[PDB]
Amino acid sequence: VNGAAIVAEAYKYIGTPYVWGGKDPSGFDCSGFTRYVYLQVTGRDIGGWTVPQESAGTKISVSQAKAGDLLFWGSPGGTYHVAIALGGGQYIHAPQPGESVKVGSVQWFAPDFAVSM
């Protein structure tokens, strides 16, 4: 149950199309994807939407994010996006209604804070 396992589970759903409110491999939104990964690996249910997922661990800087941690866009209480940290400025996410689950870099779109799990 290390972050490597979270990353390995998240990689299984690359190419899953975006579906608003989707919570399973037929379609994910940003929060549904992270919730599903953590449900598969740990069995516990972090929030179904973005803001409850801000409580699942301890807040931390994006620099101090290891593989498996959660990354949040927006301010605490008003986060609008989440991804799973891959380490080294990389993450994996359900990006937006346009796109399917894919990898991304903080050099493209930088998250605002992170959460250790």
Numbering used by the authors: 414 to 530
Which sentences did the original study use to describe this structure?
The protective activity of E. faecium growth media was protease sensitive, which led to the proteomic analysis of the supernatant and discovery of secreted antigen A (SagA) as one of the most abundant E. faecium secreted proteins. SagA encodes an N-terminal signal sequence, predicted coiled-coil domain, Ser/Thr-rich linker region and C-terminal NlpC/p60-family peptidase domain. The identity of GlcNAc-MDP was further confirmed by LC-MS/MS analysis and its fragmentation into MDP.
Gel-filtration analysis revealed that SagA-NlpC/p60 is monomeric and amenable to crystallization (Supplementary Results). The overall dimensions of the structure were about 32.5 × 30×23 Å and shared significant structural homology to other NlpC/p60 hydrolase domains. The root-mean-square deviations between superimposed Cα atoms was a range of 1.6 ~ 2.0 Å when comparing with NlpC/p60 hydrolase domains of other structures. The conserved catalytic triad (C443, H494 and H506) of the SagA-NlpC/p60 domain was located in a putative substrate-binding groove between the subdomains in the α2 and β3–β4, where electron density for these key amino acid residues were well observed. Indeed, single and double Ala mutants of W433 and W462 significantly abrogated hydrolytic activity of SagA-NlpC/p60 domain. These results demonstrate C443, W433 and W462 are crucial for the SagA-NlpC/p60 peptidoglycan hydrolase activity and encompass the enzyme active site as well as putative substrate-binding groove.
